[PDB]
Design a protein around this ligand. Structure first.
Ligand code: HEM
Length: 106
């Protein structure tokens, strides 16, 4: 990963969800989100670079990727069923973990 490109891509996919009037495009974008989260989980966050080497939190800063990717799977389960709307609604919930959790770790 770099990190920059994975973070912007997680954002870009959320932007696609604000437009995509069909479960097709909502899902195709959200797929790229999952890929970017997977690679971001393989990156080192500067907010916690000076951390302890083996800090049990840093090691598990991953918790946000686990929580976020969890909610991405649930959101994908909406549009994949055809609830493209409810996917777009719950996309606002993904924004807490990019806003709140960003304060901790960003
Ligand atoms: C929908 C979920 C998320 C979105 C869309 C998002 C988006 C972004 C964006 C745009 C940036 C910085 C781009 C820039 O200023 O050039 C960023 C940076 C960052 N994010 Fe997120 N983020 C998300 C979730 C998360 C989560 C959950 C974590 C931690 C588990 C995290 C950790 C970070 C870190 C460390 C950076 C700073 C790296 C840098 O300066 O580029 N993000 N994110």
């Amino acid at each position: 990963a770099d990190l920059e490109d994975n973070m912007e891509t997680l954002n870009d996919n959320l932007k696609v969800i604000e437009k995509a009037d069909n479960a097709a495009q909502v899902k195709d974008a959200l797929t790229k989100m999952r890929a970017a989260a997977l690679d971001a989980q393989k990156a080192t966050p500067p907010k916690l670079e000076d951390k302890s080497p083996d800090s049990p939190e840093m090691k598990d800063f991953r918790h946000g990727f686990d929580i976020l990717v969890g909610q991405i799977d649930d959101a994908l389960k909406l549009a994949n069923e055809g609830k493209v709307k409810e996917a777009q609604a719950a996309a606002e919930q993904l924004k807490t973990t990019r806003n709140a959790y960003h304060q901790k770790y960003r």
